[PDB]
Amino acid sequence: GSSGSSGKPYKCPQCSYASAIKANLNVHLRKHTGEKFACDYCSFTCLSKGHLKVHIERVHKKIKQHCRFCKKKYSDVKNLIKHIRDAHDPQD
Ligand SMILES: [Zn+2]
Ligand SMILES: [Zn+2]
Numbered sequence: 001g002s003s004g005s006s007g008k009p010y011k012c013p014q015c016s017y018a019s020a021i022k023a024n025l026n027v028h029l030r031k032h033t034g035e036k037f038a039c040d041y042c043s044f045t046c047l048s049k050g051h052l053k054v055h056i057e058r059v060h061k062k063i064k065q066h067c068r069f070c071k072k073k074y075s076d077v078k079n080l081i082k083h084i085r086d087a088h089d090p091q092d
């Protein structure tokens with residue numbers, strides 16, 4: 001085999017786990033982490049829901065949007081909903 005000798009230097013700070021590879025320690029620590037809260041507007045993720053609120057309140061507040069029925073542009077997603085409820089209503 002082309003692999004190196006035994007010893008498992010890369011060790012977990014939280015449990016008895018060890019490996020010979022840094023990527024195996026990185027992947028293992030993902031079990032010990034907190035909850036991932038994802039953004040509703042981008043691929044962003046956070047371990048703190050209060051920082052995720054600030055991310056949306058700064059990055060995705062008064063965000064440009066378009067209608068899925070008439071392709072009209074809108075200045076806020078909340079303004080687009082009122083347009084869909086008036087012009088494209090679900091009969092419910
Ligand atoms: Zn561990
Ligand atoms: Zn985002």
Ligand SMILES: [Zn+2]
Binds near residue numbers: 069070071
């Ligand atoms: Zn529309």
